Amino acid sequence: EVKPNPLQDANLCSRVFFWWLNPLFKIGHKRRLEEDDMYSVLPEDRSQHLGEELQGFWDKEVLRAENDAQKPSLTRAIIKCYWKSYLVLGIFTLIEESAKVIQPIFLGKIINYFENYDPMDSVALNTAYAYATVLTFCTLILAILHHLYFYHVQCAGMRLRVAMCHMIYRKALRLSNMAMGKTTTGQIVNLLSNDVNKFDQVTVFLHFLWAGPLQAIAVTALLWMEIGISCLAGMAVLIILLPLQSCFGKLFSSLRSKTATFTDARIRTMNEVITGIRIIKMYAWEKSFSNLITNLRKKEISKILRSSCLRGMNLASFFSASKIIVFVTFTTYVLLGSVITASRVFVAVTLYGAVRLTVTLFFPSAIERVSEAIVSIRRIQTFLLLDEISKMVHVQDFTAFWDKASETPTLQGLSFTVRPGELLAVVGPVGAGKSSLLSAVLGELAPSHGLVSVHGRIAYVSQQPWVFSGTLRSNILFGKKYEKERYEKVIKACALKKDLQLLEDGDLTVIGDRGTTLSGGQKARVNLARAVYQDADIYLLDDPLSAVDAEVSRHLFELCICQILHEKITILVTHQLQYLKAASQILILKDGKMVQKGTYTEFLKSGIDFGSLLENRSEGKVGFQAYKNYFRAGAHWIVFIFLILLNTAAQVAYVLQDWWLSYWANKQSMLNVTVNGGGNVTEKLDLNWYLGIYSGLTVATVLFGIARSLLVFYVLVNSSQTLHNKMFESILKAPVLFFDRNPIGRILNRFSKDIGHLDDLLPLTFLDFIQTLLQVVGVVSVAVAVIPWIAIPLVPLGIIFIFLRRYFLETSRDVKRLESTTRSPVFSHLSSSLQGLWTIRAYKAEERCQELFDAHQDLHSEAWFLFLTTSRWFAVRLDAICAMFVIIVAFGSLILAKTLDAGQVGLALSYALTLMGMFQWCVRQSAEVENMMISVERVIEYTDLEKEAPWEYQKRPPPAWPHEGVIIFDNVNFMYSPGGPLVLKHLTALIKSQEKVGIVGRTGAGKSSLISALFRLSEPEGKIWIDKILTTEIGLHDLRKKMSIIPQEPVLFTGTMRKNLDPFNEHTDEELWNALQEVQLKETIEDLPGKMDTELAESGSNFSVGQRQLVCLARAILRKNQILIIDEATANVDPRTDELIQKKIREKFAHCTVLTIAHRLNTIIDSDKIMVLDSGRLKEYDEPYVLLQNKESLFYKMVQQLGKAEAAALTETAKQVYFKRNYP
């Protein structure tokens, strides 16, 4: 019982006020919260019991539905299981709705007291005090019960999600062969990522579904009995607000998809240009790339601006709907010929605002959440309805089918009998049927016809390794007893001493899955150890030495097989004669059947030959520099001043609307009391003038809101576009060191996540936070204007709020980080367990994996529950502060009743009763903005990235230079970092004139050094001369574009063949035709009609290495180059095309300087001079005579180590080329 759980012995007062989160917050504020400081879940929150009971209900419902010939459902089971928990919360929901509906009644009863107020009447004062006390009490119980019910619903949804994921895992752990072949890991991944997550959100409004219409009808009847028939216009407007918002959301989703497809295209293009950034940087093709990038960016930003304007119009309509409804209803009421009373007006506006908020917040969210939950439940149901699964070996023609589509038998002839001590070898080509046997013996294969007889425990060894998360010792011993001799034999017999002397703490270390720290060799070692640790009788393994060195695998065989498995039943699958020495029996598979079984001797003497067969985020608040840069990048100071003035004018108009409304109410009350208070002459107030002023103020505030929203959206979109353009221009001119240090995945993440955030979530959240803050500021200003005494308690309340917000965020950040870092291991372990379902079903040890998944889900639910409790405590505190402020305002207004009219107190109370919920929404929006500002910070930091030398200086190069292309070596080297490593030193030689020259280099001892020094991507150490002219005057484009690239990554470009060969196509088509007919390129493209503008894909979907190298040589000869480089061309090439392109490049490029890099030793013979590089130093750069005459040179030893026949061939070719070169 480690990590005891709080709130288990707490009373009702501490549970209803969340007073048990004091020690956790006190620990999280002083230091960092780890995984050991968390609080365990409740006993009823365990995954095991919930999963078991929900699975029981599911199977009971399935049986009840199948017994009566109907299809089973899971929603009915969920209802029958959680109705006891839902009906209890329904009563609290109904009580809360009734309280929220009756609150405006007491509000109006309080406001009506000031109309007929009498300072000499005690009954009215007592009634007003009682009504104020009742209002305070109902507000308090509302603010409490709302968060209580929210926390209860969140806990119920979390438990439901845990139970559902447990059932899904339990059902996936029992899948059959067809189910395993019909489902992919990513399917279960997105299932457990979306379906169980929607359950935590659908339950929030599952009760609002029915709470909506009842509250709406109640408020409608109240407004009716209050004012009359003038509610019809408001109800009609509220009704027609739904289809307009529906079409607006549909158009917004369409525009969002239209921008998302372009965003995906741009992300793919960016990844393609970044993964091969050296290719574009050398060819100087940045111009056309930037052109197409800005073209796609504009094509996307058009729809982005359209969607932003649509969202701004929708937000302005949602914000002004309350004012429009109020104005329309009041115009309809005045047109009837009645009087205006402050209490009824305030009740009407409050009820209308509440109904609008409800209808436009809960109802559509409820509908969409219920639809998503129903879809998820149906998906889970159709996923769970799949087909589940049901001392010597001896079989009699067990004929089973693996491909049920074709009823033909796939493999026959099963007759095997082995004795204790035999070693059996299996050899076969691809698709021979070894996996069929390994699955039939283990029972994975469905029995159709035959016999399967095995005795004792049996284990399975997959061809690919498998492991779960945790330690290494218990991983190897698999939860069994840590026995001495067994474990010691396995560890000394698995070549683990080197691993342990390279490991941290032996087998007691925490090692993750997915190979984050373990290579293939040691992984095969540990899986072989976990397989042979059980010491079963029959052992079936499938080549566990595929990813390990040969001699060590043979040694491991000699230590394991004849020592531990020498008395066990072993049927091994071999590859070739390297493992046919200790094998007593051998079985071969030919087109699904065998011919005979016997000793390796009987099979060898028969004449059978197998040759035909063969991260440091800124902790705290973001600095103001990022905000200033983000505001100045897309807008100027005048634009910001205009936006601030527009927002201020909009807020002022929104305030003066209600101000003039209350003023007109007070004027009408005064007119009534003067015409009824002993007055004969009547003066009816001019209704047209007041109606005109009201309509003018309404249209003014509506236009102001629309304009400020449009301006905010435009400014934010322009700022995002400018930031993206600046980042692109800074990365395009950045050196290759930035791409070498930061991997491609980091750049992809920074280009995807930050861009998507700034495009979708930043503008809407920012404008919502700004609008809510402006509303709160206006409410506070109205409160201080009505009562000047509210400004006194504003300082302590504000200080307490700021301190509480900081104290809560300091812990919420760490809690969210822990939740994010604990959510992914669950899915990782799920994928790892699903990848090795064969070994799990074979070992019959599903209980261990089930318990591991249950513990992972328990930890995840624990972190989620801690986060929910922290958020609920913060919300309770915020609502309590707001309620206390409302109580203080109401008391201060009721005390000074002699100097306050009815309209003033009514407006003050109506404005104070709107802070509840709105305040916490503003706080959460500010928190989300501060959390998302890290993307803007990273974008600005990437924009402020240092640039290298300019592309071209003021000195224009001549149209003939370079003419010769002579390079002079004068102490030139390369630097990987300023003041870092250095291998090359004192490199000096002399090159020939327009004739072949060669550079030799061995693997691992200067390869990367030579590629860096010869290509010269980064600024190298030393002074470089091209034809004895200084190099520090022009960038990389005009100088390092004359080389031909022969890397492991061929020419990959998407689009028309023009942009692939020459994106600027300065020359006409005739020379291009001639060059492609010279390089034999047309005969391959004759197939498709896209001779010139065909669509090509990346990563070589339909392209081979051959035609790619051919078109590369074609582009090289099109560039009209005088320097040519070839290296490491014998990696992924076919011999035919290899010799073809070799002969072609030999006969063609024979008129100028050819800088051939010598990776092999046969292609260098056609050169003239070679300098031998060793440890970053050359010996001599002369003809091969000095290296073939002197015997102590290293060239001689390479000649021997490359083979005697190859030695004779190379020396023969050398003598030949020397004889044709000296005396022609």
Ligand X SMILES: CCCCC[C@H](O)/C=C\[C@H]1[C@H](O)CC(=O)[C@@H]1CCCCCCC(=O)O
3-state DSSP: the chain helix, strand, coil percent, rounded to 5? 65, 5, 30
Opening angle at CA 771, ends 769 and 776, nearest 5: 90
Question: For residues 698 and 979, is the Cβ–Cβ distance under 8 A?
Answer: no
CA 525 to CA 494: how far, in whole Å?
6
The nearer residue to ligand X, 462 or 772, going by C-beta atoms, is 772
Burial class (CB within 10 angstroms; exposed 0-12, middle 13-18, buried 19+) of 1170: buried
In the complex, the smallest distance separating the C-beta of residue 366 from ligand X, rounded to whole angstroms, is 11
In the complex, the smallest distance separating the C-beta of residue 1047 from ligand X, rounded to whole angstroms, is 51
What residues contact residue 959 under an 8 Å CB cut-off, 6+ apart? none
Strand partners, 593: 590
CA 1071 to CA 1115: how far, in whole Å?
11
The nearer residue to ligand X, 357 or 989, going by C-beta atoms, is 357
The nearer residue to ligand X, 357 or 564, going by C-beta atoms, is 357
Residues after which the chain has a gap (C–N > 2.5 Å): 390, 614
Q: Which of 890, 897, 906 is nearest to 661 (CA)?
A: 906
Question: For residues 665 and 903, is the Cβ–Cβ distance under 8 A?
Answer: yes
CA 935 to CA 925: how far, in whole Å?
16
CA 716 to CA 704: how far, in whole Å?
18
In the complex, the smallest distance separating the C-beta of residue 108 from ligand X, rounded to whole angstroms, is 18
The nearer residue to ligand X, 731 or 882, going by C-beta atoms, is 882
Helix axes 484-492, 520-532, angle to 10 degrees: 150
The nearer residue to ligand X, 314 or 574, going by C-beta atoms, is 314
The nearer residue to ligand X, 100 or 523, going by C-beta atoms, is 100
What residue is closest to ligand X based on CB? 917
In the complex, the smallest distance separating the C-beta of residue 805 from ligand X, rounded to whole angstroms, is 17
User: Looking at 952-1046, which runs of residues are DSSP E strands?
Assistant: 967-968, 996-1000, 1025-1026
CA 615 to CA 930: how far, in whole Å?
17
- 996-1000 vs 1170-1173, strand pairing mode: parallel
In the complex, the smallest distance separating the C-beta of residue 107 from ligand X, rounded to whole angstroms, is 14
Burial class (CB within 10 angstroms; exposed 0-12, middle 13-18, buried 19+) of 1191: exposed
Helix axes 47-67, 75-115, angle to 10 degrees: 110
Contacting positions for ligand X (CB under 6 A): 357, 361, 772, 917-918, 921
The nearer residue to ligand X, 361 or 1194, going by C-beta atoms, is 361
In the complex, the smallest distance separating the C-beta of residue 920 from ligand X, rounded to whole angstroms, is 7
- The number of CA neighbours under 13 Å toward the Cβ of 712 is 25
- 1025-1026 vs 967-968, strand pairing mode: antiparallel
The nearer residue to ligand X, 364 or 409, going by C-beta atoms, is 364
- 458-460 vs 538-542, strand pairing mode: parallel
Can you say whether the dihedral through the CA atoms of 479, 485, 486, 492 is positive or negative?
A: positive
The nearer residue to ligand X, 779 or 984, going by C-beta atoms, is 779
In the complex, the smallest distance separating the C-beta of residue 917 from ligand X, rounded to whole angstroms, is 3
Query: Could you tell me the two tokens for 293?
Result: 């990038």
In the complex, the smallest distance separating the C-beta of residue 361 from ligand X, rounded to whole angstroms, is 5
The single residue listed with the structure tokens 């190859």 is 1206
CA 135 to CA 109: how far, in whole Å?
10
The nearer residue to ligand X, 450 or 917, going by C-beta atoms, is 917
In the complex, the smallest distance separating the C-beta of residue 812 from ligand X, rounded to whole angstroms, is 17
Q: Which of 537, 375, 391 is nearest to 453 (CA)?
A: 391
The nearer residue to ligand X, 772 or 1153, going by C-beta atoms, is 772
The three-class DSSP label of residue 960 is coil
CA 96 to CA 110: how far, in whole Å?
21
CA 645 to CA 663: how far, in whole Å?
26
Strand partners, 539: 459, 570
In the complex, the smallest distance separating the C-beta of residue 908 from ligand X, rounded to whole angstroms, is 17
The three-class DSSP label of residue 781 is helix
Q: Which of 755, 915, 1188, 847 is nearest to 353 (CA)?
A: 915
Question: For residues 294 and 270, is the Cβ–Cβ distance under 8 A?
Answer: no
User: Looking at 909-965, which runs of residues are DSSP E strands?
Assistant: none
CA 1186 to CA 759: how far, in whole Å?
66
The nearer residue to ligand X, 801 or 1025, going by C-beta atoms, is 801
The nearer residue to ligand X, 768 or 1021, going by C-beta atoms, is 768
- Residues belonging to the binding site for ATP are 428-435, 1001-1008
The residue type of 1218 is Y
The nearer residue to ligand X, 592 or 917, going by C-beta atoms, is 917
In the complex, the smallest distance separating the C-beta of residue 663 from ligand X, rounded to whole angstroms, is 26
The residue type of 81 is C
In the complex, the smallest distance separating the C-beta of residue 926 from ligand X, rounded to whole angstroms, is 13
In the complex, the smallest distance separating the C-beta of residue 893 from ligand X, rounded to whole angstroms, is 21
Query: Could you tell me the two tokens for 766?
Result: 């920012």
CA 766 to CA 1029: how far, in whole Å?
57
In the complex, the smallest distance separating the C-beta of residue 215 from ligand X, rounded to whole angstroms, is 12
Question: For residues 779 and 353, is the Cβ–Cβ distance under 8 A?
Answer: no
- Residues belonging to the binding site are 428-435, 1001-1008
The nearer residue to ligand X, 357 or 1188, going by C-beta atoms, is 357
In the complex, the smallest distance separating the C-beta of residue 714 from ligand X, rounded to whole angstroms, is 22
